[PDB]
């Protein structure tokens, strides 16, 4: 079993650094590319950037450049997230995503999340923000994009946990996804639909183009339980 191990919460002074650390189990990083983002307070994931862990190369969300700094060690299998200059603003929930270098993005892993409290571009679009849905209702949540996009993937976030790949490739369901879900669109829409809800389908809903940098994600769709 694959898992990327977060170092735990920090709580630090405005004006300072902190070093975060992801170590993987089960998977050599040097295998892909080790992603780092950062969901805020509102509950949106924004993308700091990715690390190749075998050659060092590294991509940085321009927003980011300058403020983060990716190293690894890849003896001991660990991705490093340095962040500087720290502020209030900063306070969130960072997380370290390694998944499928190329090619269908099939198989996706997230740590668990470090929460870092601080003491003092291809925007796409998802509709409906919010809505209510009770079991056996059908349920179709879209995302358009500002530019055409190759592909759209789709992650399923629940109450205290990190993002989950549902719908990868538009419309490849990912492993453990129920057929009752479905993906597609092209160009610069695309939408997830629910023939029949669950109960068990109440999360938040992201939708993520992975074809132009900085990558980019939906602001999400909270789906409810009617």
Same mark, same amino acid.
């Given at each position: ?6 170092? !735990? #919460? ?14 993987? @189990? ?29 050659? !060092? ?24 997230? $340095?962040?500087? @200059?720290?502020? @209030?603003?900063?306070? #969130?929930?960072?997380?370290?995503? &390694? !998944? ?11 740590? %668990? ?7 003092? &571009? ?13 079991? !056996? ?8 994009? /500002? /530019? ?7 992650? %399923? $976030? ?36 629910? /023939? ?5 389908? =109440? =999360? ?6 992975? @074809? ?15």
């Amino acid at each position: 079993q694959v898992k990327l191990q977060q170092s !735990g #919460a920090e709580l630090v002074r405005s004006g300072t650094s902190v070093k975060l650390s992801c170590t993987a @189990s089960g998977f050599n990083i040097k295998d892909s590319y080790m992603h780092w983002l950062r969901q805020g307070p509102e509950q949106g994931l924004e993308w700091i950037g990715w690390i190749d862990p075998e050659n !060092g190369d590294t991509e940085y969300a321009p927003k980011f450049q300058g403020k983060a700094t990716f190293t690894t060690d890849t003896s001991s299998n660990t991705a490093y997230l $340095q962040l500087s @200059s720290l502020t @209030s603003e900063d306070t #969130a929930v960072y997380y370290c995503n &390694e !998944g499928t270098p190329t090619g269908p993005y099939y198989f996706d892993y997230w740590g %668990q999340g470090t929460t870092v409290t601080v003491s003092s &571009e291809n925007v796409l679009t998802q509709s409906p923000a919010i809505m209510s849905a009770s079991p !056996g209702e059908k349920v179709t949540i879209t995302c358009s994009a /500002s /530019s055409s996009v190759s592909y759209m993937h789709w992650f %399923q $976030q629940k109450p205290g946990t990190s993002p989950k790949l549902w719908i990868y490739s538009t419309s490849n369901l990912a492993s453990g996804v129920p057929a009752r879900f479905s993906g597609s669109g092209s160009g610069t829409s695309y939408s997830l639909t629910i /023939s029949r809800m669950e109960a068990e389908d =109440a =999360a938040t809903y992201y939708c993520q183009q992975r @074809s132009s940098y900085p990558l980019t994600f939906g602001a999400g769709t909270k789906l409810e339980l009617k």
